[model samples]
Target: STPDEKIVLEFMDALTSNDAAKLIDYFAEDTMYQNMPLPPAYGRDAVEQTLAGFFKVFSIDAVETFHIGSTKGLVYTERVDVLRALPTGKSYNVSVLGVFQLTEGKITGWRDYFDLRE
Candidate 1:
């Protein structure tokens, strides 16, 4: 097992860049993703597909860490992300808290809490 802080930072970088390939590489085969406004996406493939759909709609402008905590193999990050929606040209400025469970340097579970109100 590696340091939780490093893994979490890498994960954030992948998301901020919308690099599905890089994101998937850090995930376990049985990874699970949960968030409101949508059902949980179980497994790596489903998570990747979900991310693709998200990227198709909004592109990330910035992701800045407001706080972060690490213990053993678990990492949690609180951050603000700016996203601009395509076509409609709407922008979303949101705050997020992401919890990550890492196993053998790969993410096995991730849950994101963010604003859903429009």
Candidate 2:
């Protein structure tokens, strides 16, 4: 098992709770977060702000991990995120590929590959 695997699992588990603050806690102060279809969010404040906005609009109902694996200091997750749009009450599931780099259990880099329309 990778040393950072536990941390990656913690980050994934955080998302299912819909607490952006809790999730962002796994990141570094100068963390770089790049999610497809949006500009990257860097630094603690920016990352928190960006995530809070998304979490405000959507609630995660489930994060089904089709596969997850780790090597060295990196973790890779392929998941389907079931989310409910708060305003519309619309529920949808989107596939995501997440790659994270960690330094001593703190996330230094995060990137997600996903489609906006799915």
Candidate 3:
């Protein structure tokens, strides 16, 4: 079964905080993370390291979640993220759609799609 909404919210909170440990706790040992503009990070360790690098490069100015819904074993989220890059001092106002597949209450797969050209 999928986790409850509160659990998913907590997971999102952990992500926004860049809490690597907390974020990994919600993921399975063999989790996969795929995002546009980058290669997929397979397994928990790789995902953790990749996320650390991402956090170091950009700061999330604002995250506005439009909707969150789940059915069966999948959770889907739609949101807007305002990000600022420290290196380039450039800002990205992007929309994102994330789908997380859960297994045994832990996330086994996550796919995020975003448009960086906008």
Candidate 4:
């Protein structure tokens, strides 16, 4: 009925670790992702590289998930990602709804819906 803990845990583990390469492992090679207010980005490679670019400057201050529930291959997450700005190291949080489609223990598609100014 719901996703197994192993799969969800691995996804969050990669996230909390902030390791792009390991994070890439949870995604299918051709996974698609959209962050909203931006064009859809395709591929696990793109996800890894783009995360590298982000990791270079924006450090995650914290991640808080309010509610996470899954059914079938779909997982819905209500969360806030707090990120620290580089140099000055200012931090802010962005609230989002993450919808993930997982198949065979791998994420085949993911998307986050949020307002840019939020």
Most TM-score-accurate candidate: 2
| lDDT tens per residue, model 2, 9-98 | 768878888888788889888688888767888787888898889988999999887778976657998899998999999999889999
Q: What would the per-residue lDDT of candidate 4 be over residues 1-118, giving only the tens digit for each residue?
A: 3554457655764575666876788888878888875887788888888777778888876778777887675788777888787878788888888788887878888888974772
Prediction 3 global C-alpha lDDT: 0.79
* Segments of candidate 4 deviating more than 4 angstroms: 4-6
Can you write out model 1's per-residue Cα lDDT over 1-118, one digit (the tens) per residue? 3477788886787677876776788889989999955678999999899888888888887898888887665788899998888878888789988989888888898999996667
lDDT, residue 39, model 2: 85
Clash pairs, model 3 backbone: none
Better of 3 and 4 by lDDT: 3
Model 2 gets an lDDT of: 0.84
Q: Write out the backbone clash pairs for model 4.
A: none
Please give the distance, in angstroms, between residue 104's alpha carbon in candidate 1 and its true position after superposition.
0.4
Locate the minimum summed-lDDT window of 10 residues in model 4.
Answer: 1-10
Better of 1 and 2 by TM-score: 2
Q: lDDT of each structure?
A: 0.83, 0.84, 0.79, 0.76
In candidate 2, list every pair of residues with a backbone clash: none
Candidate 2: segments with Cα more than 4 A from true spot: 116-118
Q: How high a TM-score does candidate 1 get?
A: 0.88
Q: After superposition, how far is residue 56 of candidate 2 from its true place, in Å?
A: 1.2
